Amino acid sequence: GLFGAIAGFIEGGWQGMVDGWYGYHHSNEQGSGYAADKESTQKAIDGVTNKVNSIIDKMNTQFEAVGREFNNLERRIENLNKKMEDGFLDVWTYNAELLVLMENERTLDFHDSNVKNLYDKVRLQLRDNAKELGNGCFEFYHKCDNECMESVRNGTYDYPQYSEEARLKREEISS
Amino acid sequence: RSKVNGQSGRMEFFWTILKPNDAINFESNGNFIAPEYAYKIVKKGDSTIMKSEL
Ligand SMILES: *[C@@H]1O[C@H](CO[C@@H]2O[C@@H](C)[C@@H](O)[C@@H](O)[C@@H]2O)[C@@H](O[C@@H]2O[C@H](CO)[C@@H](O[C@@H]3O[C@H](CO)[C@@H](O)[C@H](O)[C@@H]3O)[C@H](O)[C@H]2NC(C)=O)[C@H](O)[C@H]1NC(C)=O
Ligand SMILES: *[C@@H]1O[C@H](CO)[C@@H](O[C@@H]2O[C@H](CO)[C@@H](O)[C@H](O)[C@H]2NC(C)=O)[C@H](O)[C@H]1NC(C)=O
Question: Quaternary structure per UniProt (chain B) (predicted)?
Fold first, then answer.
């Protein structure tokens, strides 16, 4: 995809994350588990909802009665009507079909971007307190219990607190 | 003319809208298919005729 995340540096999605579109998987002493990110899932569901509703809303619908009212000596008008009728069907069929094809590409790129942005959100929080494994995961240079993982997931991770413990583990890896 | 339902004669029908307070005046010395009934109409809009076997 355009943003390189979905089916890219994150290979495959998660059957085990039932409660949202994008989220986290943690792994520490206490145990592993999945958690949906609700801010970014709700935003995305807002956008896609709005997209769908606009594609339907913005259509202008008028009353029209369409029949075959011309007789056997009015074939020239009947053909004018056919050209008109057929012409609008060609227009609406092409627009609908391309509209769907084109907004289907944008919706999938939207999700790609949403996932890449979330990865970047955690990246920017953790800085060098974690190694970047490159498959969408961060290996922590410190001990990160459940309340720490929650702080990453809700955007309140305290870099300073763990900063020292982390650099002693990085210094240590330089052996 | 060719027979249609046994008949070679033809019947040709004509119509008109008669405004409120106008009069219609017939004069004929033959061949007249005269009205007995007519129809009151008010028209506030239009549609078309649908063809359906339902
Ligand atoms: C169709 O008929 C109407 C109504 O006709 C009236 O009622 C019928 C049941 C019969 O009794 C008719 O003889 C009678 O006229 C005609 O309209 C009416 O026209 C008359 C005149 O021909 C109007 O009378 C006038 O009244 C004014 C004051 O109101 C005087 O100044 C005039 O001198 C005259 O008397 C009458 O008002 C009018 N009524 C209505 C409701 O419009 C109508 O003319 C007729 N069709 C045609 C083609 O004329
Ligand atoms: C983000 O998650 C953190 C981590 O749990 C929350 O902060 C802790 O909340 C618990 C309540 O379950 C308290 O016992 C701790 O005292 C809190 N710890 C710290 C370091 O503050 C926090 O409430 C959440 N914040 C937001 C904005 O969602």
Answer: Homotrimer of disulfide-linked HA1-HA2.
Question: Quick count: other Cβ atoms within 10 Å of Cβ B14?
Answer: 5
Domains in chain A: boundaries: 1-175
Searching chain A, which residue's CA lies closest to the CA of residue B47? A65
The distance of A69 to chain B (nearest Cα, Å) reads 8
Fold category of A1-175 in CATH? Hemagglutinin Ectodomain; Chain B (3.90.20)
Judge whether B31 and B25 are in contact, CB under 8 Å: no
Please report the resolution in angstroms: 2.9
CB-CB contact of A66 with B49 (8 Å): no
> Which residue is closest to A63 within chain B, CA to CA?
B47
Experimental technique for the deposited model = X-ray
Residues 6+ apart with CB under 8 A from A175: none
At A32, give phi and psi (nearest 5°): -100, 175
